[PDB]
Design a protein around this motif. Sequence first.
Motif: not given
Lengths: 261, 261, 263, 263
Positions: D143-151, D184-194
């Motif tokens: 999912x996303x770290x945004x699930x904990x802290x939505x903007x 659920x795994x909640x990624x913050x900012x990751x070093x991907x091509x996207x």
Amino acid sequence: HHMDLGIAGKTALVCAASKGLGRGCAEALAAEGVNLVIVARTRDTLERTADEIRAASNVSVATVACDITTPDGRAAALAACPQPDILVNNAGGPPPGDFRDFSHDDWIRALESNMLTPIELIRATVDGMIARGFGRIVNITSSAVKAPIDVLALSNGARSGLTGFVAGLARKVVGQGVTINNLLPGLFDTDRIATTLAAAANAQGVTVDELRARRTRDIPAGRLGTRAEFGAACAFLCSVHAGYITGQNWLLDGGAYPGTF
Amino acid sequence: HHMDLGIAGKTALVCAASKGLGRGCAEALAAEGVNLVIVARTRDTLERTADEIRAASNVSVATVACDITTPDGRAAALAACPQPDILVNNAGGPPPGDFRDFSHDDWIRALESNMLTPIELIRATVDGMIARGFGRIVNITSSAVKAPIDVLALSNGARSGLTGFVAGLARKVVGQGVTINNLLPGLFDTDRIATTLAAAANAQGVTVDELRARRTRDIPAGRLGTRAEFGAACAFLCSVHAGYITGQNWLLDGGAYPGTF
Amino acid sequence: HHHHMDLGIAGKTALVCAASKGLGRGCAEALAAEGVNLVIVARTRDTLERTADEIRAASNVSVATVACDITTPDGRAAALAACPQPDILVNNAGGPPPGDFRDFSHDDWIRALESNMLTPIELIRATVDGMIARGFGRIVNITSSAVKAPIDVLALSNGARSGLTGFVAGLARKVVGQGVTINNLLPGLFDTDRIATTLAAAANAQGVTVDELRARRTRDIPAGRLGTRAEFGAACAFLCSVHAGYITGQNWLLDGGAYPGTF
Amino acid sequence: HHHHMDLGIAGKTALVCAASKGLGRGCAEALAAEGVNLVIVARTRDTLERTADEIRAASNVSVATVACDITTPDGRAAALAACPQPDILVNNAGGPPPGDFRDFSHDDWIRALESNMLTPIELIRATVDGMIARGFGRIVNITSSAVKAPIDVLALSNGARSGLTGFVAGLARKVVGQGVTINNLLPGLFDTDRIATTLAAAANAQGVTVDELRARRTRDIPAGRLGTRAEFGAACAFLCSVHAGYITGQNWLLDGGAYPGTF
């Protein structure tokens, strides 16, 4: 037919109530007819605040000048208010710092002020509330309980300990007509905050108006809270309309804390 | 000098308000002088409830009998209340079941009723609140948002989606004088709950009084909530004393939910 | 054939508290299997040295023992003399007995805060600067699922473990950029000797079979079983690994789904 | 010499969504190193089959590919035809673009709910009964770290991922006693091509260097770096292991401490 909170003639013990949020709570409760016993360390300010509340409302306002974190000071407050219907726990936090510099005694003093003294005051009054079928306990903690601040380790720890204790006890007594809830203030416009702000302003070289705009920029509501609106929330929790609400941690911070919960 | 919520003469749109918690909210707001537009699907009950509120308070109470989950029904409600100061979102949840049995269309209907329709009503009214510098949005969700129930997957999902959306939007508009907060009811003593209780009572072979004592045993407060105390909480959130409170999820469940937060 | 997960911490040193049995022993054994040299702490010598014997036989790492009371200044000094520069610190202590807080003395609170909050904080204070200097540290605090869902009879550990959790949250964000993580493991009900002993006394007090009481508590666990010290140790080892440096300030619940909260 | 962690899942099968690159590819590669045979899904064939080529060379497992759109019934049927009985399911999908919800059409919400909530739920519905029948299942939702802290600008994925999270919480307690976990795994900012592509368009739109904008977002991460798809995949693999059967309904935040909440 405005909202009748139904607590006229009850009695409230309000801690650290000569100024700031504690004062706001006492003012709001007296405005609803609650007789008060208000506690602070300094006699002069406590008496002036009592005089002002007494003149503005039609309730008695007794004062206890004592250090409520000591056994004899705690006994002094309880002798003035042995059977409160309402208890407002409230205490100043320790100064910011680095936990590498804190002694064991620093930790003990912080735990006494912001955790164990609230628990002992609850311990001393809750059976009377149970026997009468009504009680309201409101603990003034901090929004740091939800998002601890780096330099406030002492109060981060002590207030989180109180919060965990409250969660367990609240479920035990609610069926007997006693609620226990925590109010978590963000940044509020009190004389303490203002003189603190003036400290870091002359230190950081900025103006007082400049540093105020900075802290405001991090508050989505674009202002500081007021002690009146904080007291209003306390009064509602203490009302006969809030008996189904217990163990709650109400954040009054203009949305600054970013968590969903 | 009791507590003046400061909202007399304002206008509230209250959804699903002919009975239960929605009705309790409308009653509490009208008692504070708020003129109402109340929405339900069935004409007869909606009109009787409006007649009762009108007679008890001194405010106008307009009614819209419509299905607010459709575009034309939503437009019907907004035509009757184009510029509310206060919006109370509220909708019945889907029946319990096993998600293996739910179709895609079941999921869509649940998301429309309990997530997308609230969001569209906010979408349609929030700019007027911003322009006037005041707004109060209160979403009636469920204590299941904090502890989802196995058989309520549809409303667990839809109401959690609304809650996440609200968390983001609340921080965006609070500086403009608009708050958005969620009320999470536990088990409340409504006609819907009662006729539901009588369903599972004749099914489980137990009496109606026996099954009521069972559900109560799991509530630490030892009783069900009342629509009056729920409406009182809604009214306080809508008051001029709650403008520093936004993005909150207030649990009104007599302590049943066991989490610290 | 298959690579299988190298946690990357072979040759590091861990200080593991209350490691003679139970969850602390599970963490010690899981770290030893990753090549981590051990200093293990407990109050009683005989059981602790027996455990060291057994870990030495089962692994290829060095194991040293300190019999001491880490709730006192002298005990903490003894532990730090034997392990002055740990890369990994596992905080762990038994909680106070249950009761009603109206019957607690003031000293009951002080002792609970010492054991379950101030002792872990002091050991972190004594070890974190070395971890920062080396650019690597892993601190894991064994707390309790009660931190998520407190019950009134555990008032003392409710309060003390919650206080530790609040402190940890603040510190963890301050040191993660220097390569040190601080995370909490929250056990539900685990199949340890202590739990089996406590359960038997409740079965004899309640007049029920041990089987009857074991089944009753298992009915409140959706996983339908107790946890093992091995799976608990495995989670500890993962948090201590080179693959967990982006994870800090977390509270990982290992309770078989017993706590019903979404978060 | 040292044993190192055997996750116990060699010879099982994982269905990994959006696995041609980024976090999904990280999960696929971490599972392949544990001996897990793979079916990997993406919309575009060329990149997906290239990734399969590379995983096959790097591991000792079989890799099969399905180029399809799992947000449609036909795409989901294609994925399930190629992997009818997965032991492991990794849900994963890109989120909608940011914007102001007052500019969203009703269809914007429907498409976001389809991609980030209903498609994962449908794939769980199609695979969970087989996992139950075999007494083992592992479902991991990215999912996303945004699930904990939505903007507010991510309103669409805020709502849809939160809805998935609320559903998962309920189901996870129902199936864990049958050997299936859902986490659920909640990624913050990751070093991907996207992320690198999105960052460059914001740097060119804002008129700043890519370095300047990279540094700015790193200043908001206490760990002082971006996450890697490898450490993300490692956490996925641990959740999928035989050592994580007591862990269910959890939301593991992998964000370098960026979110400041205690819980």
